[PDB]
Design a protein around this nucleic acid. Structure first.
Ligand SMILES: OC[C@H]1O[C@@](CO)(O[C@H]2O[C@H](CO)[C@@H](O)[C@H](O)[C@H]2O)[C@@H](O)[C@@H]1O
Ligand SMILES: OC[C@H]1O[C@@](CO)(O[C@H]2O[C@H](CO)[C@@H](O)[C@H](O)[C@H]2O)[C@@H](O)[C@@H]1O
Ligand SMILES: [Mg+2]
Length: 580
DNA sequence: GCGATCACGTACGTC
DNA sequence: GACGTACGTGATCGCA
C-alpha cells in the first residue's frame, strides 16, 4: 500500500500552484544551519518529491517559496523557515501550521510530528517520524525511496487535515488565535532565533578560570572538614558523609534516600561548617557546569553567537520554552551568577541591549479576571503589591509593615496565583499547615473577588472540561473530576493558575507582534533577541535608545486593554547585565 | 565483557 | 504554577 507521487528530477510549474501543503524536511533536532534532506509538495495537481540540492537551486522554486501570494500549509514552519534563512532563502505565505493548530486544540496531546496531529482526526496514513528516522542515537535519514514516501505522506496528511483542524479551531473560537497570534509570532521567533545573541567568550572563559580555582579551594576545604575525599557531586556519597560520618540530623528524605537539597542544607548549616562549604560548592559548580561550560559548548565558534530555539508548541499554559541553550534561565538572583549576563553583548559595535519587563503582570491579570475591587484599586494606585497584601492580611498601616511581613505577604501572593494549598504555602514559608491556612483565609477576606474567582473557575473547569485565557487559549483538565484528592487538587490549582499565566502569555505574544510592526513602521534597526515570559530583550544602535524608551513600554502596555493598567519597566546598557 | 546509550531520580537555574 | 540542563547511577543495548 504505497502512496502515489512523482519523484521529480526537476521543478515544474504545476509544482508551484498558489495553494499547497509543503514539507521542507530538517531531521536534525537543532535546525540551525542544518541540512534540508528532502522536499515534498502536494497540491491540486498531485504529489511531488524534490531533492533539496536541485529544488533550492531552482530560481523559480525559490521565488515560489518567497511569494507571499503562494499559500503553503505546513507542520512546524519555523523549523523550515530558519533552516532556509541559514541558506539565504526566504519562506513566505505560510497560511496554516498544523503543529501550532494541534497545539492550540490540545497542548496536553504533546503533538510533535505530523502523525501525532493526524491521529487526533483518525488519520493514520502516515508514520511517526521516530519510526522512520529511529531514536536519538540511531537516528538517521533513510534511503531516498523510504524518505520520499514519508515526506509525501506527511504533506498529504497536512493537505487533508487543514480544513478539519481549522473547523474545530473555529468552533473553539480559536481561529484568530492561530491566524492572528501564533502564526505571525512563529515568523518573529524565527527571526529572533536566526539573529542569535552575541557572546563574549573571552569573558566566559575568564570566569571559568576563576570558578575553577574557587572550586578547587572549596573542594579541598570540604575534604578537610569531612576528613576524607569523595564525590561531592554524588547524593549518595554526600549523604553518607553528612548523615552518617558527621551524624547530621535527617530532616527530610527522598524516595531514594537522604535529601541534600539547598533547602535542607541551610537548616543543617549551624551544626557543621562543612554545610556552608557544600552550599557554596553547589553554587559555583552550577555556574561552571551549566552556564560557563554549557554555554561555550553551544556558541558558534565563527560568529560567537548562540542561537536558541523557542519551542512554541510545548507548554500547557501557552508560554514559550527555550533550548540549546536555554536563554530563559540565565542567573540573576545572586550577584555571582548574575555576572554571567555580562557575557551577553550587542552583535554590532555601538549597539546596546534594551530590556523591558511587565511589572506584576500575573497579579494585574488576576485583578482583571476576578474583578476584585481591592486588587484593582491597588494597581490603579500602582501600589507596591506585596506591601499592600501585608497591610491587608496582617491588618497594619504601611509604615507598620516589616521586612519579614512583606516577605511572607509576597509568598502568599505567589501562592494565590499558583492556587497553592495550605501545605504548599507552609512548605515554602517553612511554617505549619494551620498557620499557612490562616494567611490564605485572611487573604480571601481582603480580596473577596479573588476568592469568588477561584471558586467559580474550578466549577467552570468541571462543567466545561477546560479553562480558557484572554485570547481563547484552552487547557483541558480531566483530572478535575478525579476522586483522588491529590490528583483532583492539582487539577484545581491548574484551573486557577492557567487562566492567569496563560493570559499573561497571550499578552506578551501580542506585544511582540505589535512591537515588530511598530519597529518596521518606524524603520528602526532595533530588533528582538529574546523573550523571557514577562520580558522582552532587544538590541539596537545606541542612537535608538531614546526612541525605544518611549516606544517599547507603550506598545507592551497597550497590547491589550484590561480593567487595570499594564506597567512596563525598562533599562539598557552595554551588556545584558547592564540592562538593569 | 566493554564502550555507548538509555532511563530516571535529584538538584537547581528562570519567571 | 510553568520550564530545561547537568549529574550520578543502574540498566540495557550492539557485537564478539
Ligand atoms: O522545531 C521545534 C519543534 O519541533 C518539536 C517536534 O515537533 O521539537 C523538536 O525540536 C526541539 C528544538 O531542537 C527539541 O527540543 C525537541 O526535542 C525535538 O523533538 C516541537 O516540540 C517544537 O515545537
Ligand atoms: O466548599 C467547597 C470548596 O472546595 C473546592 C476545593 O477547595 O471544591 C470541592 O467542592 C466542590 C463542590 O462545591 C467540587 O466541585 C470540587 O470537586 C471539590 O474539590 C472549592 O472549589 C469549593 O469552593
Ligand atoms: Mg518583571
Amino acid at each position: 500500500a504505497k502512496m502515489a507521487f512523482t519523484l521529480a528530477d526537476r521543478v515544474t510549474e504545476e509544482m508551484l500552484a498558489d495553494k499547497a501543503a509543503l514539507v521542507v524536511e530538517v531531521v536534525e533536532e537543532n535546525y540551525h544551519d542544518a541540512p534540508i534532506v528532502g522536499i515534498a509538495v502536494v497540491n491540486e495537481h498531485g504529489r511531488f518529491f524534490l531533492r533539496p540540492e536541485t529544488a533550492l537551486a531552482d530560481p523559480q522554486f525559490v521565488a515560489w517559496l518567497g511569494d507571499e501570494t503562494k499559500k503553503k500549509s505546513m507542520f512546524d514552519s519555523k523549523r523550515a523557515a530558519v533552516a532556509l534563512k541559514w541558506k539565504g532563502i526566504e519562506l513566505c505565505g505560510v497560511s496554516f501550521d498544523l503543529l501550532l493548530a494541534a497545539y492550540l486544540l490540545d497542548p496536553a496531546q504533546g503533538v510533535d510530528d505530523v502523525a501525532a496531529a493526524a491521529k487526533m482526526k483518525q488519520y493514520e496514513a502516515v508514520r511517526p517520524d521516530e519510526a522512520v528516522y529511529g531514536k536519538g542515537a540511531k537516528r538517521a535519514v533513510p534511503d531516498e525511496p523510504v524518505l520520499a514516501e514519508h515526506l509525501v505522506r506527511k504533506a498529504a496528511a497536512i493537505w487533508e487535515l487543514e480544513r478539519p483542524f481549522l473547523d474545530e479551531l473555529r468552533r473553539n473560537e480559536q481561529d484568530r488565535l492561530l491566524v492572528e497570534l501564533e502564526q505571525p509570532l512563529s515568523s518573529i521567533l524565527a527571526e529572533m532565533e536566526f539573529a542569535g545573541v552575541k557572546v563574549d567568550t573571552k569573558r566566559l572563559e575568564q570566569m571559568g578560570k576563576e570558578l575553577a580555582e574557587q572550586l578547587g579551594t572549596v573542594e579541598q576545604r570540604i575534604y578537610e572538614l569531612a576528613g576524607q575525599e569523595f564525590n561531592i557531586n554524588s547524593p549518595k556519597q554526600l549523604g553518607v558523609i553528612l548523615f552518617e560520618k558527621l551524624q547530621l540530623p535527617v530532616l527530610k528524605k527522598t524516595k531514594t534516600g537522604y535529601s541534600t537539597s539547598a533547602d535542607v542544607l541551610e537548616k543543617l548549616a549551624p551544626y557543621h561548617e562543612i554545610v556552608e562549604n557544600i552550599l557554596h560548592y553547589r553554587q559555583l559548580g552550577k555556574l561552571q557546569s551549566t552556564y560557563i561550560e554549557g554555554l561555550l559548548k553551544v556558541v558558534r565558534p565563527d560568529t560567537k553567537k548562540v542561537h536558541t530555539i523557542f519551542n512554541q508548541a510545548l507548554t500547557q499554559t501557552g508560554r514559550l520554552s527555550s533550548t540549546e541553550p536555554n536563554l530563559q534561565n540565565i542567573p540573576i538572583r545572586l550577584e555571582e551568577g548574575r555576572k554571567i549576563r555580562q557575557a551577553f553583548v550587542p552583535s554590532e559595535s555601538d549597539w546596546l541591549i534594551f530590556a523591558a519587563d511587565y511589572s506584576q503582570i500575573e497579579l494585574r491579570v488576576l485583578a482583571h479576571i476576578a474583578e476584585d475591587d481591592n486588587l484593582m484599586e491597588a494597581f490603579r494606585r500602582d501600589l507596591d503589591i506585596h506591601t499592600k497584601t501585608a497591610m491587608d492580611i496582617f491588618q497594619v498601616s504601611e509604615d507598620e509593615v516589616t521586612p519579614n511581613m512583606r516577605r511572607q505577604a509576597k509568598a502568599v501572593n505567589f501562592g494565590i496565583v499558583y492556587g497553592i494549598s495550605d501545605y504548599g504555602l507552609a512548605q515554602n514559608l517553612n511554617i505549619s499547615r494551620k498557620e499557612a491556612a490562616e494567611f490564605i483565609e485572611r487573604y480571601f477576606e481582603s480580596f473577596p473577588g479573588v476568592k469568588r474567582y477561584m471558586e467559580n473557575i474550578v466549577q467552570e473547569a468541571k462543567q466545561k472540561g477546560y479553562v480558557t485565557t484572554l485570547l481563547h487559549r484552552r487547557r483541558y483538565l480531566p483530572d478535575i473530576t478525579s476522586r483522588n484528592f491529590n490528583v483532583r487538587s492539582f487539577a484545581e490549582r491548574m484551573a486557577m493558575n492557567t487562566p492567569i499565566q496563560g493570559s499573561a502569555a497571550d499578552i506578551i505574544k501580542k506585544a511582540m507582534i505589535d512591537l515588530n510592526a511598530r519597529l518596521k513602521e518606524e524603520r528602526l534597526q532595533a530588533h528582538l533577541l529574546l523573550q523571557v515570559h514577562d520580558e522582552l530583550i532587544l538590541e539596537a544602535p545606541k542612537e535608538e535608545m531614546e526612541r525605544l524608551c518611549r516606544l517599547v513600554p507603550e506598545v507592551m502596555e497597550q497590547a491589550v486593554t484590561l480593567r487595570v493598567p499594564l506597567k512596563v519597566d525598562y533599562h539598557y546598557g552595554s551588556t545584558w547585565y547592564d540592562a538593569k
